[model samples]
Target chain A: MKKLREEAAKLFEEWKKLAEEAAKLLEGGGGGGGGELMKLCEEAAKKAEELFKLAEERLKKL
Target chain B: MKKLREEAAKLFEEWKKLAEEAAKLLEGGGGGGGGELMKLCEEAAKKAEELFKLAEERLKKL
Candidate 1:
């Protein structure tokens, strides 16, 4: 893979780790049934969205 | 940072390049006004969604 791809794969992993954490929360959690889990998910979602936006930036060719 | 993060970052770049290609198409293209550009966007979207799904894999902890 090219260096650029390598770097992107790395971001994927970072987001993965966050996703994993959120996943763990889903597997078994009892804080209001889904409060913290949602929080974690939101965080992961934000990261994913950021990645999407980054992609959008390219769409703009800037 | 770590190898995992490094690899994830690389994926981000890969997606970015695809995004850039799509972006260029948007910058100046007139094939039916929006045929190929949509194609490119979908392709990039698929990658981002894949990355998202990859994140989900961890959620299931499988």
Candidate 2:
């Protein structure tokens, strides 16, 4: 009935995951892989950036 | 030297909080404080977006 709402929810979860992973970059808990920490942070940052753009579009109408 | 790293880490925590707050909105949480949920979601989204841009700029040098 409201799949779009779910879609948005998915993004919200994703946002959290990204943040958690990013935080690991500084936590030394990423298992020490090829710049794994840095990579995670990068991905998290990128996700956050994208979420902001999407939220503007999603919330403006609601 | 490590303070900047901490700043980034702080952003990560904020990112998770934003996401959590956003999810709570879909669930109708945040109390009935005049679209307070929406306001928080929007702010979180905006912050994430800004963090992304900042991350790109910061990571470029590392």
Candidate 3:
């Protein structure tokens, strides 16, 4: 299989890894828990969103 | 530049290659042609659309 660009590849792996960690946190904490855990999950999700935006940029044409 | 996700990178190459091939077929076939060449172009276009959808799936979260 072809490999992704070095930067994007690293970000993609980080995004997946962090997202999973967030999911596990949410599962353990439950939805209503709004403390350091929620903050951490939100931060992780935001970072993933940013990574997605960056990844999309690499694919853009025109 | 950063690289794309692994699955997306291969799909991206395939998509571009097929698109170029389709354009060549269309150029040779011209507007009046509605035979195997047209069919080839259409099939290639459809394949590209499918690939785009697949790539999009890799980006989706949740």
Report fnat for all candidates as fractions from 0 to 1. 0.00, 0.00, 0.00
| TM-score of each model, paired residue for residue | 0.28, 0.33, 0.29
Candidate 1: stretches off by over 4 Å: A1-62, B33-40, B49-62
lDDT of 2 by residue, B25-53 (tens): 65462123345544544455555555555
**Residue A56 of model 3, lDDT score:** 45
Report lDDT (Cα) of residue B18, candidate 1.
48
| Better model by TM-score: candidate 2 vs candidate 3 | 2
DockQ of each: 0.03, 0.04, 0.02
- The DockQ score of candidate 3 comes to 0.02
Off by over 4 Å in 2: A29-62, B1-34, B45-62
lDDT, residue B47, candidate 1: 48
lDDT of 1 by residue, B1-62 (tens): 33333333333344445456544544342222345534534354444554444444433333
- Please give the ranking of all candidate structures by DockQ, highest first, separated by commas: 2, 1, 3
List the global CA lDDT of all models. Answer: 0.42, 0.50, 0.40
Number of the top candidate by TM-score?
Answer: 2
